[PDB]
């Protein structure tokens, strides 16, 4: 947490969006969509029964 430069969801989304795609000005909606589709999209992320 000390190392963390962010303190809110929006800046975390910005950092995630910039690390996943270099540059790429962090549009808030784009960052939210990227984060949701990375791990919470059934058509983009799945673990299956196993």
């Amino acid at each position: 947490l000390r190392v963390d430069p962010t303190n809110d969801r929006l800046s975390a989304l910005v950092e995630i969006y910039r690390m996943m795609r270099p540059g790429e000005p962090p549009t808030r909606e784009a960052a939210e969509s990227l984060f949701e589709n990375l791990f919470f999209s059934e058509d983009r992320y799945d673990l299956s029964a196993v």
């Binding site: 910039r18 795609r21 270099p22 540059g23």
Partner: protein
């Protein structure tokens, strides 16, 4: 942006992101100023006789 990038796609998106989208009447206003410019150049050609002589030759 300056993000140790080497992809022209990325900074092309950067370039296109600077300009904001237009509306329906915005296109009409820009085309209106275009029409004003082309009318100005048409008047400039109008004050020139020789181009008009050439046009009449083709007519």
């Amino acid at each position: 942006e300056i993000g140790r990038t080497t992809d022209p796609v990325r900074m092309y998106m950067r370039e296109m992101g600077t300009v904001e989208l237009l509306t329906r009447e915005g296109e009409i206003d820009i085309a209106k100023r275009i029409e004003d410019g082309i009318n100005q150049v048409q008047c400039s050609v109008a004050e020139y006789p020789e181009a008009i002589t050439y046009l009449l030759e083709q007519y």
